[PDB]
Amino acid sequence: MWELEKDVYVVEVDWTPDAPGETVNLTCDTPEEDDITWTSDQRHGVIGSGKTLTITVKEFLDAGQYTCHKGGETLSHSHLLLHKKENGIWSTEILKNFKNKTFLKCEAPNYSGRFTCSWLVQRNMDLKFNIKSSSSSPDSRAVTCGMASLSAEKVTLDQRDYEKYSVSCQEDVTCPTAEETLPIELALEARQQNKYENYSTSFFIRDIIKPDPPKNLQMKPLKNSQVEVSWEYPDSWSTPHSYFSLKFFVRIQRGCNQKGAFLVEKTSTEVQCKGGNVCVQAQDRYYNSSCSKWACVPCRV
Amino acid sequence: MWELEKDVYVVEVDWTPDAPGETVNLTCDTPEEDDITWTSDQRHGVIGSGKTLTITVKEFLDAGQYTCHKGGETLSHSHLLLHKKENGIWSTEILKNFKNKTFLKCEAPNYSGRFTCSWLVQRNMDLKFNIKSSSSSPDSRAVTCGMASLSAEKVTLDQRDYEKYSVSCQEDVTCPTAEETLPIELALEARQQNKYENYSTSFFIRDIIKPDPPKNLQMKPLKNSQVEVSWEYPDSWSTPHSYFSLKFFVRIQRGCNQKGAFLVEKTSTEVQCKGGNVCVQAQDRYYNSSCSKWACVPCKHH
Ligand SMILES: *[C@@H]1O[C@H](CO)[C@@H](O[C@@H]2O[C@H](CO)[C@@H](O[C@@H]3O[C@H](CO[C@H]4O[C@H](CO)[C@@H](O)[C@H](O[C@H]5O[C@H](CO)[C@@H](O)[C@H](O)[C@@H]5O)[C@@H]4O)[C@@H](O)[C@H](O[C@H]4O[C@H](CO)[C@@H](O)[C@H](O)[C@@H]4O)[C@@H]3O)[C@H](O)[C@H]2NC(C)=O)[C@H](O)[C@H]1NC(C)=O
Ligand SMILES: *[C@@H]1O[C@H](CO)[C@@H](O[C@@H]2O[C@H](CO)[C@@H](O[C@@H]3O[C@H](CO[C@H]4O[C@H](CO)[C@@H](O)[C@H](O[C@H]5O[C@H](CO)[C@@H](O)[C@H](O)[C@@H]5O)[C@@H]4O)[C@@H](O)[C@H](O[C@H]4O[C@H](CO)[C@@H](O)[C@H](O)[C@@H]4O)[C@@H]3O)[C@H](O)[C@H]2NC(C)=O)[C@H](O)[C@H]1NC(C)=O
Numbered sequence: 003m004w005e006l007e008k009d010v011y012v013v014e015v016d017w018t019p020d021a022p023g024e025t026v027n028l029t030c031d032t033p034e035e036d037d038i039t040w041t042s043d044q045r046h047g048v049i050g051s052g053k054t055l056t057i058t059v060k061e062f063l064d065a066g067q068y069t070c071h072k073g074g075e076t077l078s079h080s081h082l083l084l085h086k087k088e089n090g091i092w093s094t095e096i097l098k099n100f101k102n103k104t105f106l107k108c109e110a111p112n113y114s115g116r117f118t119c120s121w122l123v124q125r126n127m128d129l130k131f132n133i134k135s136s137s138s139s140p141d142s143r144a145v146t147c148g149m150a151s152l153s154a155e156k157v158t159l160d161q162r163d164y165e166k167y168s169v170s171c172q173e174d175v176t177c178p179t180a181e182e183t184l185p186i187e188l189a190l191e192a193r194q195q196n197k198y199e200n201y202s203t204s205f206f207i208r209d210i211i212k213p214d215p216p217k218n219l220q221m222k223p224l225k226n227s228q229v230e231v232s233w234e235y236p237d238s239w240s241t242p243h244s245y246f247s248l249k250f251f252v253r254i255q256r257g258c259n260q261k262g263a264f265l266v267e268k269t270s271t272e273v274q275c276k277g278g279n280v281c282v283q284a285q286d287r288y289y290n291s292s293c294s295k296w297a298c299v300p301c302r303v
Numbered sequence: 304m305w306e307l308e309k310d311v312y313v314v315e316v317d318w319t320p321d322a323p324g325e326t327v328n329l330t331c332d333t334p335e336e337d338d339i340t341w342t343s344d345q346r347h348g349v350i351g352s353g354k355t356l357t358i359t360v361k362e363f364l365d366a367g368q369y370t371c372h373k374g375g376e377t378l379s380h381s382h383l384l385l386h387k388k389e390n391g392i393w394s395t396e397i398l399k400n401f402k403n404k405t406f407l408k409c410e411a412p413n414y415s416g417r418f419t420c421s422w423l424v425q426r427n428m429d430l431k432f433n434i435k436s437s438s439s440s441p442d443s444r445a446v447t448c449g450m451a452s453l454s455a456e457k458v459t460l461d462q463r464d465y466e467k468y469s470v471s472c473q474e475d476v477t478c479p480t481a482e483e484t485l486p487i488e489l490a491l492e493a494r495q496q497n498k499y500e501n502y503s504t505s506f507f508i509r510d511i512i513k514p515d516p517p518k519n520l521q522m523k524p525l526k527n528s529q530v531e532v533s534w535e536y537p538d539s540w541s542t543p544h545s546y547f548s549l550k551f552f553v554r555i556q557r558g559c560n561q562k563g564a565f566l567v568e569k570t571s572t573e574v575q576c577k578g579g580n581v582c583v584q585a586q587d588r589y590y591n592s593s594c595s596k597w598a599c600v601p602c603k604h605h
């Protein structure tokens with residue numbers, strides 16, 4: 003057993019059929035020692051007595067809020083969370099993993115240090131999240147995360163729509179241009195009713211980069227079946243652009259889709275369409291990170 | 304007098320003819336107090352006695368290793384180095400200054416933070432060098448230098464060729480784009496026998512930059528007395544090249560010389576030669592730092 007916060011404890015439990023439950027002592031926060039009575043918010047009536055209550059916690063009915071009493075007045079209460087362990091593996095049942103079998107997915111629009119991480123939930127009910135820097139060493143990368151919020155966007159995997167959550171974070175001290183020598187290690191604590199689980203992830207900001215689509219994609223014809231297309235770097239992207247260079251792929255219509263797109267490092271090109279869309283996306287010139295969303299415009303005069 | 308390291312002390316001395324030497328007390332590192340005697344590695348026999356030896360240090364014979372003894376066994380020893388001061392000036396006799404009358408010359412091939420400093424020596428014998436960050440304040444630039452090594456190259460000044468030393472250094476913390484707001488202040492300690500001197504220098508890495516010569520200098524003709532010459536930035540140079548841009552000068556034949564060289568910011572040009580060499584050197588586009596070495600290459604029927 004271990005303390006999560008004031009008067010909230012987590013109990014690790016082996017979830018095999020014939021497992022011996024953990025015996026946990028819960029003492030009352032009062033100077034008195036007589037006429038002490040205990041109750042649970044999962045059971046009817048008095049379930050114990052004595053200043054210290056000793057119980058065997060195996061099932062989830064053995065969890066919850068245990069309340070003290072003396073002479074009809076309440077005294078204190080302690081909360082029990084369960085951390086399931088089955089076949090040697092810690093449970094991961096509150097969150098739904100993405101197609102790539104990861105649970106936490108983070109992406110950053112630039113190298114400033116700000117980024118967001120997101121996850122999916124199997125059932126959006128009675129949830130409590132909290133995310134922070136897992137490693138707390140001096141040579142760790144300090145991060146200041148916000149509070150988790152339910153997002154309007156709903157990811158659809160298999161034939162099910164999962165609600166997604168998200169949280170924005172900022173790296174404390176930064177030098178965008180500097181090379182990253184060690185990763186950002188994060189940890190999400192997840193609760194659902196009286197179930198406790200936790201998810202961890204490590205990453206370099208360079209690997210999670212995904213620029214925003216190029217802005218001001220304008221049109222200008224040239225001759226029969228030819229048109230010059232121009233654009234400019236997005237406002238979100240890191241500055242100066244001479245250092246944080248970008249490359250672009252250009253495809254035609256009728257992550258990184260490289261089926262029939264041609265590379266252009268400059269911010270303009272000449273191409274033939276005369277019917278259909280001319281779409282262009284961006285990527286960091288020097289590192290193979292995630293590409294941007296497509297920015298499309300028709301091919302009409 | 305002041306301590307350089309454990310049991311090694313430096314004595315500042317005015318080297319005018321009739322100068323009063325500095326009196327220095329040397330105590331023994333032992334709990335005993337009787338039968339204590341002193342010797343020197345510059346003098347024969349016992350030169351003193353008592354737990355504390357008091358001597359007048361003026362000449363170099365008064366320097367060296369002073370050893371402590373009791374009952375035939377050695378106890379401890381202290382080393383004395385001399386720092387000469389003549390006409391108010393601290394001596395600079397171990398090192399030979401360059402043509403520009405400086406002693407330390409540093410150069411960097413890129414903005415990484417790595418660089419090297421070099422110096423010359425008048426006589427390569429019984430030398431000990433050590434270089435470090437002179438200022439040790441919080442707002443100073445921290446540097447981690449290596450060990451000084453004798454170089455194969457020998458600079459030739461006047462009518463004599465002098466042996467050269469060099470040491471590579473790295474600036475602890477770096478930010479590629481960042482502007483340098485204060486310089487890198489270094490200090491070299493030099494010893495030769497029992498003589499101590501020290502040399503200092505301050506610089507911004509941007510000022511010591513000297514790129515390496517441009518690589519893959521290929522040729523491709525055009526017409527009678529016309530030919531296109533192309534090259535590419537050197538591998539040592541900082542990246543990305545869109546930020547760390549370079550300039551190039553192109554001269555003809557038959558450390559920026561630029562006597563008859565013409566500027567080209569792009570990595571190629573068309574020029575007339577039809578006989579001779581076409582040489583090209585590089586420089587940082589935006590700062591007037593040192594230029595690179597030259598990269599040279601030579602130049603019927605219907
Ligand atoms: C993700 O999820 C995992 C899985 O739960 C988290 O891992 C757990 O973290 C907690 C807190 O960091 C760990 O608890 C600590 O455990 C140590 C060591 O405990 C063992 O050794 C002790 C020796 O004194 C012993 O007392 C312990 O006994 C208890 O537990 C057993 C059952 O295991 C039970 O039978 C006993 O009756 C006891 O109740 C155990 O054998 C312990 O020393 C710590 O306590 C000290 O330090 C704290 C901090 O100051 C202090 O407050 C205490 O008073 C005490 O001085 C503390 O209990 C837990 O062990 C981890 N789980 C595992 C499997 O190792 C992980 O933290 C989560 N990560 C994130 C990022 O959220
Ligand atoms: C390059 O070369 C120059 C030239 O030598 C170096 O300059 C010298 O650096 C050293 C170390 O930083 C300096 O020594 C210190 O001196 C101070 C002040 O000393 C004066 O005032 C003292 C007042 O208490 C007094 O005691 C001193 O007296 C001694 O010297 C006189 C002769 O000058 C002699 O007659 C006496 O008998 C004494 O022996 C002197 O008047 C001193 O306070 C320092 O000591 C304290 O701090 C150290 C550090 O913690 C500590 O260990 C000590 O116990 C003590 O608490 C220390 O001795 C020296 O003064 C500098 N030279 C000059 C001319 O100023 C320079 O450092 C070199 N640079 C590089 C980068 O290598």
Ligand SMILES: [Cl-]
Nearest residue numbers: 407408409506
């Ligand atoms: Cl210099």
